[PDB]
């Protein structure tokens, strides 16, 4: 599978108890709309925990859009250990059955929130 790449910088808050999933943008996104393009928006989801659900701003016909949405990982840092966050990019063609061009996830427990987790995350097309 292949969904391109997504740049992000995730930081942690110990006052309200939430992780700041600050993504930069996604590059080389799959097509969906009639024109080798799509309306990909990242829908931040979580494992069983399911204590968080945010919808990004639809990006009309764009396979390399920038925006940097602020996703608040509603879950105490101490709890993060048992919560695997999942970022799925959903299309918004606005005609056919919006498909999941791709997604990405990482075991928070392995994500040592020392300061800020910044990296060039790889995107994969998870057939859903």
């Amino acid at each position: 599978e292949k969904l391109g790449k997504l740049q992000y910088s995730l930081d942690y808050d110990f006052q309200n108890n939430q992780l700041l999933v600050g993504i930069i943008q996604a590059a080389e996104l799959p097509a969906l709309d009639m024109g080798g393009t799509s309306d990909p928006y990242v829908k931040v989801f979580l494992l069983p925990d399911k204590k968080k659900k945010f919808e990004t701003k639809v990006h009309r016909k764009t396979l390399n859009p920038v925006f940097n949405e602020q996703f608040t990982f509603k879950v105490p840092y101490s709890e993060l250990g048992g919560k695997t966050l999942v970022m799925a990019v959903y299309d918004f063609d606005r005609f056919s059955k919006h498909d999941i061009i791709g997604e990405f996830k990482v075991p928070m427990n392995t994500v040592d929130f020392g300061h800020v987790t910044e990296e060039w995350r790889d995107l994969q097309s998870a057939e859903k």
Binding site: E1, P48, G81, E103, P107, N109, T110
Partner: protein, 133 residues
């Protein structure tokens, strides 16, 4: 010492972390007791995957999607096979008819039935269970 049988696939730190909910992912951690299943050969060649002392029982969704929690339906019966590549292979006899054998995504989760055939090397799982040697 038959106990917590760890199993995963695809080169890279990632273990199958099962949760009572059902959404099992390839968590790369060994601190929290949630990446162990009671893998054993129930019948002649038929091995079952049940995370008894840690999670739940598996129940593949028509092979296509791999899951488990409610009940260990026949979908969870797999034929124990070994590959000369230092990896274990399990054929979901329940769907063997379609040449489909349980396959998971190290960085995604267990759900690749449509590609459980000889397509994704992810089918070659690497087990790290506490045998009785």
């Amino acid at each position: 010492y038959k106990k917590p049988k760890l199993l995963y696939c695809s080169n890279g730190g990632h273990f199958l972390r099962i949760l009572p909910d059902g959404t099992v992912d390839g968590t790369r951690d060994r601190s929290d007791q949630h990446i162990q299943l009671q893998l054993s050969a129930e019948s002649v060649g038929e091995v079952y995957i049940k995370s008894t002392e840690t999670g739940q029982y598996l129940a593949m969704d028509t092979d296509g999607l791999l899951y488990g929690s409610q009940t260990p339906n026949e979908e969870c019966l797999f034929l124990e096979r070994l590959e000369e590549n230092h990896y274990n292979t399990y054929i979901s006899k329940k769907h063997a008819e379609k040449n489909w054998f349980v396959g998971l995504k190290k960085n995604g989760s267990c759900k690749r039935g449509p590609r459980t055939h000889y397509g994704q090397k992810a089918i070659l799982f690497l087990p790290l269970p506490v045998s009785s040697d």
